[PDB]
Design a binder for this molecule. Structure first.
Ligand SMILES: O=C(O)c1cn(C2CC2)c2cc(N3CCNCC3)c(F)cc2c1=O
Length: 81
């Protein structure tokens, strides 16, 4: 699928970053601990499995926590609608 504007409403199944790195699941706390952007308390941003999302409305578009233990997050690569 494509993304509208900055992709805040994107609900597709892309689950890798721009470089191909697998995404970490939003509910997971490994390999990266995070107190923010958890599905338990954010019920409105579609924080589902390990899919690319944009809960903070970054102009750069949808992103995910990465499975690389050194690198916290990266943007994904989804075309503009
Ligand atoms: O406290 C935390 O766990 C985090 C706090 N922040 C904000 C900076 C204070 C984050 C910001 C991130 N970026 C997402 C993409 N748009 C820019 C901000 C991010 F990927 C993760 C976190 C955290 O885990």
């Amino acid at each position: 699928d494509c993304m509208f504007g900055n992709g805040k409403g994107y609900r597709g199944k892309k689950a890798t970053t721009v470089t191909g790195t697998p995404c970490q699941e939003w509910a997971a706390q490994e390999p990266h601990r995070h107190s923010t952007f958890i599905p338990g308390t954010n019920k409105w941003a579609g924080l589902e499995k390990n899919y690319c999302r944009n809960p903070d409305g970054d102009i750069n578009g949808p992103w995910c926590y990465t499975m690389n233990p050194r690198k916290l997050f990266d943007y994904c690569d989804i075309p503009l609608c």
